[PDB]
Coordinates of N, CA and C and ligand atoms in Angstrom, one line a residue:
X143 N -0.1 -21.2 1.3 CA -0.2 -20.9 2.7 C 0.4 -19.5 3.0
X144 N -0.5 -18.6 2.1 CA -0.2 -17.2 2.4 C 0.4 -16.7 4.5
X145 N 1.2 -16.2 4.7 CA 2.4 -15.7 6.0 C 0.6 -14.6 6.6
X146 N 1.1 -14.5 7.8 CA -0.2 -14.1 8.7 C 0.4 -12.5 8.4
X147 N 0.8 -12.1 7.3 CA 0.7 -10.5 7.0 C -0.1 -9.6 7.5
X148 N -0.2 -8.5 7.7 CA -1.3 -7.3 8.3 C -1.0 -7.4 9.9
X149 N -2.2 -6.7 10.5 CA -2.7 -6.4 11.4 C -2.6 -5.5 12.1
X150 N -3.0 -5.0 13.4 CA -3.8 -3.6 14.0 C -2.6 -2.7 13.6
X151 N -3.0 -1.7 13.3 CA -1.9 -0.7 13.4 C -2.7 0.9 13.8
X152 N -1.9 1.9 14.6 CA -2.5 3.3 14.8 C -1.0 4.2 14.2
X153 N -1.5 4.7 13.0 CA -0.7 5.8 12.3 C -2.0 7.0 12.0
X154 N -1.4 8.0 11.3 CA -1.9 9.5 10.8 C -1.7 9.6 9.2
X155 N -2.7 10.2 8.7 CA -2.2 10.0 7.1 C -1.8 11.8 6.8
X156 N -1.5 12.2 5.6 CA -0.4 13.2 5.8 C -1.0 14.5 5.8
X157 N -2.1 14.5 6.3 CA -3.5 15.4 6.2 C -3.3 15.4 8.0
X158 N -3.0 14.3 8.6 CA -3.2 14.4 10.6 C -4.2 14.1 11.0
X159 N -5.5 13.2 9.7 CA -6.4 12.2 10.1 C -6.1 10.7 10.7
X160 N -7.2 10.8 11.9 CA -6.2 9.4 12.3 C -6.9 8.1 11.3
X161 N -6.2 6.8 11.0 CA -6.0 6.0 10.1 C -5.4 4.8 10.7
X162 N -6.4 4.0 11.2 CA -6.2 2.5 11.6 C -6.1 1.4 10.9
X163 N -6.3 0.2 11.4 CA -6.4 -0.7 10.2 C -8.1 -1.2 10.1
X164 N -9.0 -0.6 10.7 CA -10.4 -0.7 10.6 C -10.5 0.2 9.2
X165 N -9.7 1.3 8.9 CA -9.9 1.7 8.0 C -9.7 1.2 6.8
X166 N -9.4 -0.2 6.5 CA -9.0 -1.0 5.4 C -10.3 -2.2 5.1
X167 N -11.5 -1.5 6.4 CA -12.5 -2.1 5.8 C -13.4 -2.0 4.7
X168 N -13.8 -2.8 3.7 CA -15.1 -2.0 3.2 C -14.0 -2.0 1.5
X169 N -13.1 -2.4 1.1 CA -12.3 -1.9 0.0 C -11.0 -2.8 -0.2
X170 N -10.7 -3.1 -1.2 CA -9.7 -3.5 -1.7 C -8.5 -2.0 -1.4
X171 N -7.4 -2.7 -1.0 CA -6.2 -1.6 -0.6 C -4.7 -2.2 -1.2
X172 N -4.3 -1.1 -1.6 CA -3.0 -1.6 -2.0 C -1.8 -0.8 -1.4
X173 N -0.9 -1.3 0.0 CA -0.1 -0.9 0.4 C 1.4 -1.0 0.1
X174 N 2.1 0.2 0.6 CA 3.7 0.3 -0.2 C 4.2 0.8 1.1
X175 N 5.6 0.5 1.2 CA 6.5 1.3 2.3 C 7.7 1.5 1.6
X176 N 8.0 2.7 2.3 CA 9.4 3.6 1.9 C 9.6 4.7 2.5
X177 N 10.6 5.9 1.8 CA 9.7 6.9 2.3 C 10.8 8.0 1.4
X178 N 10.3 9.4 1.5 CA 10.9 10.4 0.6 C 11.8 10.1 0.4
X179 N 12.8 9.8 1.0 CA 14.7 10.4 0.8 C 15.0 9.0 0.4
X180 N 14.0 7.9 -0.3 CA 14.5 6.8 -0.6 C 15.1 7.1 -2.2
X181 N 16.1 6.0 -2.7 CA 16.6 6.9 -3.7 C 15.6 6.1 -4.8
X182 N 16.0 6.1 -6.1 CA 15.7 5.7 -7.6 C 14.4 4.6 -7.2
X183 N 14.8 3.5 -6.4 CA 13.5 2.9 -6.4 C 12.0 2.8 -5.4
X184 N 12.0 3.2 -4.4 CA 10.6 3.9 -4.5 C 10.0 5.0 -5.7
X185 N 10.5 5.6 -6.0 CA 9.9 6.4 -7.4 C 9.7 5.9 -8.0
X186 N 10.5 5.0 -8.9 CA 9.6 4.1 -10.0 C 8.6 3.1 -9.4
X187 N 8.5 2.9 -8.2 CA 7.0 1.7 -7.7 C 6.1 2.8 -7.5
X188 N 6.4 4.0 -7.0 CA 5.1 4.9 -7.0 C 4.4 5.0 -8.5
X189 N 5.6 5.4 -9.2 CA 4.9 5.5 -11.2 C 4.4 4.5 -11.2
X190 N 4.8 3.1 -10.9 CA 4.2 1.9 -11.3 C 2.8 1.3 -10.7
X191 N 2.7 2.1 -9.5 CA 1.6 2.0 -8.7 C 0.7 2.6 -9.8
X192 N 0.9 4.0 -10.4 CA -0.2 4.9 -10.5 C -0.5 4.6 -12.0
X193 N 0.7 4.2 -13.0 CA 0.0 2.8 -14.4 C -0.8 2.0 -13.7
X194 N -1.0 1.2 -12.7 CA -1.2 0.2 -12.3 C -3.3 0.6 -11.7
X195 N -3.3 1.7 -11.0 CA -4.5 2.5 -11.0 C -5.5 2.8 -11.8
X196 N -4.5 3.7 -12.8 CA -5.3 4.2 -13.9 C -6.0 3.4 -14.9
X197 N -4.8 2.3 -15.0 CA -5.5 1.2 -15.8 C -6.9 0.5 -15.1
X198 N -6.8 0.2 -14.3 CA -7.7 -0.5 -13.6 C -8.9 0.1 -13.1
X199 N -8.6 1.4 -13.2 CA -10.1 2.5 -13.0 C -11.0 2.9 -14.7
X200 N -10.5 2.9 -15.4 CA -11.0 3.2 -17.1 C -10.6 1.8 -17.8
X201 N -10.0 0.6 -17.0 CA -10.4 -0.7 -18.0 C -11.0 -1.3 -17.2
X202 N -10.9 -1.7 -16.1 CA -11.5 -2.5 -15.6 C -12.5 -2.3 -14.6
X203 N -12.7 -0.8 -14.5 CA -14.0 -0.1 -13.6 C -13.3 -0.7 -11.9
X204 N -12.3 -1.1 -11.5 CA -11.8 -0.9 -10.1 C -11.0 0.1 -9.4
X205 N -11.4 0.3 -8.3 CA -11.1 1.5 -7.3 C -10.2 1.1 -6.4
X206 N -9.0 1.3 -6.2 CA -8.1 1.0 -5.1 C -7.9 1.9 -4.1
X207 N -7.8 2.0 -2.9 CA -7.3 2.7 -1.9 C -5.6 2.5 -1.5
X208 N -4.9 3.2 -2.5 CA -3.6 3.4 -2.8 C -2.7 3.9 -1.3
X209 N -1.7 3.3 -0.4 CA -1.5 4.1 0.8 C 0.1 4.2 1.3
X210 N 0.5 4.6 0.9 CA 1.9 5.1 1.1 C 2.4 5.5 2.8
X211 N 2.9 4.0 3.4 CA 3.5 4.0 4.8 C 5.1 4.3 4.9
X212 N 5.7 5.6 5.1 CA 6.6 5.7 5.6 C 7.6 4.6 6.6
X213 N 8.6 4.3 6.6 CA 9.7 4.2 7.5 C 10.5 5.0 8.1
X214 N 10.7 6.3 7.8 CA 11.6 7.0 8.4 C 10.5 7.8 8.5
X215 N 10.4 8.1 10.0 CA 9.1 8.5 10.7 C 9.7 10.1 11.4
X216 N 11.3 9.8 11.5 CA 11.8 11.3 11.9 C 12.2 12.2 11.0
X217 N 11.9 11.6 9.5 CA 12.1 13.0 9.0 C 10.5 13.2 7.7
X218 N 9.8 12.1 7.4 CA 8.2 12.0 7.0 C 7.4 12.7 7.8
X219 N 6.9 13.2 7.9 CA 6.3 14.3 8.8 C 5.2 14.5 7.7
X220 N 3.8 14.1 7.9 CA 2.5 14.5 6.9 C 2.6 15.9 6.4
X221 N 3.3 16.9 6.5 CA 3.6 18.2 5.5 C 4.6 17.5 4.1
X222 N 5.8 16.6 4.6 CA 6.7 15.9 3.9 C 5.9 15.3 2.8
X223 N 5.2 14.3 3.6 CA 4.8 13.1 2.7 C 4.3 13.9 1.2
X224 N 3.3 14.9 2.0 CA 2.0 15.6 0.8 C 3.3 15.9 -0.2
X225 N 4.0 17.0 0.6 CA 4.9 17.5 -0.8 C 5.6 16.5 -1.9
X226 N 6.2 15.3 -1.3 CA 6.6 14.3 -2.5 C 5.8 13.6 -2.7
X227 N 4.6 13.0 -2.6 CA 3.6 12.3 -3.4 C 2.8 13.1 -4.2
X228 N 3.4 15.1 -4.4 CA 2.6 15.6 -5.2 C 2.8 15.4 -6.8
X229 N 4.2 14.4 -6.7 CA 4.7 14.2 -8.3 C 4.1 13.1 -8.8
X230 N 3.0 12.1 -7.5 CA 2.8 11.2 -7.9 C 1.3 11.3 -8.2
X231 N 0.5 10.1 -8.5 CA -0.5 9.6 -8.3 C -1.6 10.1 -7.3
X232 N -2.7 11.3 -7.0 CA -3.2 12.0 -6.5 C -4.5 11.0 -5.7
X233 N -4.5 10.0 -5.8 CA -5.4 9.2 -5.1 C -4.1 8.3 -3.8
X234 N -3.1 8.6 -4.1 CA -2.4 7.6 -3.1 C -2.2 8.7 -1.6
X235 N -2.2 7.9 -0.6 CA -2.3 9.3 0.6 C -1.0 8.3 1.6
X236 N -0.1 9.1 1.7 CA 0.8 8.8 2.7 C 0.3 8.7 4.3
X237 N 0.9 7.8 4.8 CA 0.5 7.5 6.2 C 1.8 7.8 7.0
X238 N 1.8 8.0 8.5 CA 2.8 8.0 9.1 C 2.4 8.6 10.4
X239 N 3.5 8.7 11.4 CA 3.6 8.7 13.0 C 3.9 8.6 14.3
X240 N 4.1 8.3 15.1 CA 5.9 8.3 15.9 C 6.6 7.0 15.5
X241 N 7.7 6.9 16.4 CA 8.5 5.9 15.9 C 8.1 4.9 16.5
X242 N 7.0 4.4 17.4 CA 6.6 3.2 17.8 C 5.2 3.0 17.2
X243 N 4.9 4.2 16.7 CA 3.3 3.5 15.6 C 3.9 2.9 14.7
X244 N 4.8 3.7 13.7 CA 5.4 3.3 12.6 C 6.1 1.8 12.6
X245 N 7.2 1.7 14.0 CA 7.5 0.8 13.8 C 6.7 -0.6 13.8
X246 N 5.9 -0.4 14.6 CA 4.4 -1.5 14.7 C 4.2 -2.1 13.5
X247 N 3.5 -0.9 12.7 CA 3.2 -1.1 11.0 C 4.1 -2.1 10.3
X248 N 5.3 -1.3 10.3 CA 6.9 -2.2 9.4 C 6.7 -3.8 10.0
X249 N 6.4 -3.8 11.4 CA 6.6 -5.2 11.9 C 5.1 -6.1 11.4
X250 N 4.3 -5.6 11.4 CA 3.4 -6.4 11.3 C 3.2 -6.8 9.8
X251 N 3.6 -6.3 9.0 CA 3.7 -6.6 7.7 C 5.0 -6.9 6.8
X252 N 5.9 -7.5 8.3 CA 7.4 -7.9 8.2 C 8.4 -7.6 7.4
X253 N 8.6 -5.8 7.3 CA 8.9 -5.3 6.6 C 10.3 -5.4 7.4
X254 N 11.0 -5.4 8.5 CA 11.8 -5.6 9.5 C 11.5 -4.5 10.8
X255 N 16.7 0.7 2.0 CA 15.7 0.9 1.2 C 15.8 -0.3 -0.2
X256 N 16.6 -1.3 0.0 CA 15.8 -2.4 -0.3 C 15.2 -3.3 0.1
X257 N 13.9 -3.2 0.4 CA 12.8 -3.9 1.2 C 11.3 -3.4 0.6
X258 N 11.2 -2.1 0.1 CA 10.3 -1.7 -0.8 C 9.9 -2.5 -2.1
X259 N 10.2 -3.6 -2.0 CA 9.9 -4.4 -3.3 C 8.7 -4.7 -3.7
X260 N 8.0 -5.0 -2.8 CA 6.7 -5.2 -2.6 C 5.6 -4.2 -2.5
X261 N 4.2 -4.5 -3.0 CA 3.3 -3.7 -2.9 C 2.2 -4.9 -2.4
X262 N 1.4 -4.8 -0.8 CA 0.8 -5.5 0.0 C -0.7 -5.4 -0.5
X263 N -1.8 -6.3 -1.4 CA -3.1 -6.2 -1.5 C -4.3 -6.7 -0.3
X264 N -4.9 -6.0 0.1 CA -5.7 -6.4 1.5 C -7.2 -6.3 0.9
X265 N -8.0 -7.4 0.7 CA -9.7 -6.7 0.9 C -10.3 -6.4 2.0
X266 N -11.8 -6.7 1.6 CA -12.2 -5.6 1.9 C -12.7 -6.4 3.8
X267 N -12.1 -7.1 3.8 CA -11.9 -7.7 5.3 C -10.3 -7.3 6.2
X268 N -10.0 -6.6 5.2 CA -8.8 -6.3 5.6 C -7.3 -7.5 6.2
X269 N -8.1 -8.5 5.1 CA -6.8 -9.4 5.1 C -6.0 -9.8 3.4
X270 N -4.5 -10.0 4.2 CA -3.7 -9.9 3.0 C -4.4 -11.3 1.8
X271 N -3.9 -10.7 0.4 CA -4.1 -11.7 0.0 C -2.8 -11.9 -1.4
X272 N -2.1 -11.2 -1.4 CA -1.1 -11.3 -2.6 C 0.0 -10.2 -2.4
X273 N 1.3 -10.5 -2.3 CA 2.3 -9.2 -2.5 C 3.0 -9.3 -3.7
X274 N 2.5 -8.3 -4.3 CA 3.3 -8.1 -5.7 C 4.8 -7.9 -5.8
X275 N 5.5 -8.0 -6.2 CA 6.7 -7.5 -6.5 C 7.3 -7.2 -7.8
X276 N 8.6 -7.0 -8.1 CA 9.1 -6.7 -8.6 C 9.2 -6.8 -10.2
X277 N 8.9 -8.4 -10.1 CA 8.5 -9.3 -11.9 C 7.2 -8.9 -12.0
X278 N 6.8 -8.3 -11.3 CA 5.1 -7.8 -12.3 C 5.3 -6.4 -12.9
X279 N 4.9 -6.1 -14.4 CA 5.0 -5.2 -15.0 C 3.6 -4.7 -14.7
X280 N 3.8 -3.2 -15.6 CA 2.5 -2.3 -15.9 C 1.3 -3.5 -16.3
X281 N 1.4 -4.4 -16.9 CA 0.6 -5.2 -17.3 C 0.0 -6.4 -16.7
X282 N 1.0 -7.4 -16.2 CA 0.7 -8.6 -15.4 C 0.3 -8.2 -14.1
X283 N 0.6 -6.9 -13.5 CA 0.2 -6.4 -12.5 C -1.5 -6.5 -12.3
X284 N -1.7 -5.7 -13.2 CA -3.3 -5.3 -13.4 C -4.0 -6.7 -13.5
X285 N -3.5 -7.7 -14.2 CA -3.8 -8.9 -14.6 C -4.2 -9.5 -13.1
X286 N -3.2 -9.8 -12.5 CA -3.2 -10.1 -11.1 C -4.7 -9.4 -10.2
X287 N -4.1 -8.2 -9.9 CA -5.0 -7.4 -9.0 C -6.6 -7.5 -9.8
X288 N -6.7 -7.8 -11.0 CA -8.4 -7.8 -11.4 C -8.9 -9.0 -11.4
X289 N -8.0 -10.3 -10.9 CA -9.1 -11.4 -10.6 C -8.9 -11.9 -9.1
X290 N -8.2 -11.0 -8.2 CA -8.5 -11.1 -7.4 C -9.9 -10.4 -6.7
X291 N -9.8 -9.4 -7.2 CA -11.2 -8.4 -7.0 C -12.5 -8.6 -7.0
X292 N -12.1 -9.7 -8.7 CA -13.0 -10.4 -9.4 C -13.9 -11.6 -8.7
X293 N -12.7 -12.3 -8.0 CA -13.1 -13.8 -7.0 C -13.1 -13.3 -5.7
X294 N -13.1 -12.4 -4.9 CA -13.4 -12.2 -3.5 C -15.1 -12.4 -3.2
X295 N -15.4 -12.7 -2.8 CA -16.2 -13.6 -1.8 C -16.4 -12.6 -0.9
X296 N -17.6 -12.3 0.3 CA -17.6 -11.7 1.7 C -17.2 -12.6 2.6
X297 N -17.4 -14.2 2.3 CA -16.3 -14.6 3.5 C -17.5 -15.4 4.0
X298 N -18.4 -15.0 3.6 CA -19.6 -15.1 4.4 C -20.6 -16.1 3.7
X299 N -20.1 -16.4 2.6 CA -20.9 -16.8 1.6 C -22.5 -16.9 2.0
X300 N -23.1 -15.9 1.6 CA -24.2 -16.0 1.9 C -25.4 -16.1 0.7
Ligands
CU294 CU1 11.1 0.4 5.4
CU295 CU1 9.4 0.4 7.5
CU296 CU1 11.2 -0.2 9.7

């Protein structure tokens, strides 16, 4: 009995396009929160994110929409975000926005820099369906994320 995770949120991604949660239609998404000035571990979930990508685009032909939400909204500023996700994984796009968008976001996906443990999977209806954490390696990771992709349904069964 997956927790009622997600829902509406209005943030900017680090470009100053606006980026709702309509936008999580149509695609498998894989969301993270943190934010630059976090120390040692957000960086290794971003590398882990981007093994976790690569593999899954040249083994297993899937496309994720990779999205990097900020918490510290007063000093992430979309110039910010671009410059430190340039070490990372070039498909992941930082999001962010005042302190009452942002804080929306963190709440709806009861987030309240150790709380970044998790990486949030949404299809393509834009509801949760698995949060990864910590015990998943480069490997069980991918394992996970490719039968869910695999067994999604439109819901609709038609
Ligand atoms: Cu946070
Ligand atoms: Cu937060
Ligand atoms: Cu917060």
């Amino acid at each position: 009995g997956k927790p009622s995770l997600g829902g509406p949120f209005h943030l900017e991604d680090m470009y100053g396009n606006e980026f709702t949660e309509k936008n999580l239609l149509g695609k498998f998404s894989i969301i993270y929160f943190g934010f630059s000035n976090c120390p040692d571990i957000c960086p290794d979930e971003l590398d882990k994110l981007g093994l976790w990508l690569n593999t899954l685009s040249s083994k297993y032909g899937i496309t994720l929409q990779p999205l990097f939400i900020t918490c510290d909204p007063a000093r992430d500023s979309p110039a910010v975000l671009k410059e430190y996700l340039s070490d990372f994984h070039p498909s992941i796009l930082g999001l962010t926005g005042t302190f009452d968008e942002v804080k929306n976001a963190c709440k709806k996906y009861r987030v309240y820099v150790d709380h970044s443990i998790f990486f949030y999977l949404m299809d393509p209806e834009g509801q949760f369906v698995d949060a990864l954490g910590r015990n998943y390696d480069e490997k069980t990771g991918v394992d996970k994320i490719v039968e869910h992709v695999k067994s999604y349904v439109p819901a609709e069964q038609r």
